[PDB]
From a paper:
The diffraction data were collected at a resolution of 1.76 Å at PAL synchrotron. The crystal belonged to space group P41212 and four molecules were present in the asymmetric unit (ASU). The final structural model contained most of the Aca10 sequence (residues from S3 to L60 out of 65 amino acids) for all four molecules. The structure of Aca10 showed that it was constructed of an α-helical bundle fold comprising four α-helices (α1−α4). Analysis of the surface electrostatic potential of Aca10 showed that most was positively charged, whereas one face composed of α4 and a connected loop was highly negatively charged. The AB dimer was a symmetric dimer, whereas the BC dimer was asymmetric. Since DNA-binding proteins, especially those recognizing palindromic DNA sequences, are typically symmetric dimers, the AB dimer was the more likely biologically relevant form. The PPI, mainly constructed by helix α4 from both molecules, was formed by multiple hydrogen bonds and salt bridges. Salt bridges formed by residues H30, E52 and K57 from each molecule were the primary forces maintaining the integrity of this dimeric interface. R44 in the connected loop between α3 helix and α4 helix is a critical residue involved in the DNA binding, which likely results in a high degree of DNA bending.
Many acr genes form an operon with genes encoding transcriptional regulators, called anti-CRISPR-associated (Aca) proteins. Aca10 is the most recently identified Aca family that is suggested as a transcriptional regulator by controlling the expression of acrIC7 and acrIC6 in P. citronellolis and in other analogous contexts. In conclusion, Aca10 from P. citronellolis is a dimeric DNA binding protein and a likely transcriptional repressor of the acrIC7-acrIC6-aca10 operon. Aca10 forms a dimer in solution and the dimeric form is critical for binding specific DNA.
Numbering used by the authors: 3 to 59
Write the structure that this text describes.
């Protein structure tokens, strides 16, 4: 399963007008974790990526 690119994560969050905190809450994660995902510091678990897409579309 492919992890999303950081730019894809940011684009998907911006598409639904969510703050980083709101996105993190949607996937039961911390704000710092979402920031690390968008910075490329950590890879986003593909299941959490799927959850985010399911809950925002």
């Amino acid at each position: 399963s492919a992890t999303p690119d950081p730019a894809e994560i940011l684009t998907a969050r911006k598409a639904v007008g969510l703050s980083q905190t709101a996105a993190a809450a949607l996937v039961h994660s911390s704000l710092r974790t979402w920031q690390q995902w968008e910075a490329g510091d950590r890879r986003m678990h593909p299941g959490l990526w799927e959850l985010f897409l399911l809950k925002t579309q």
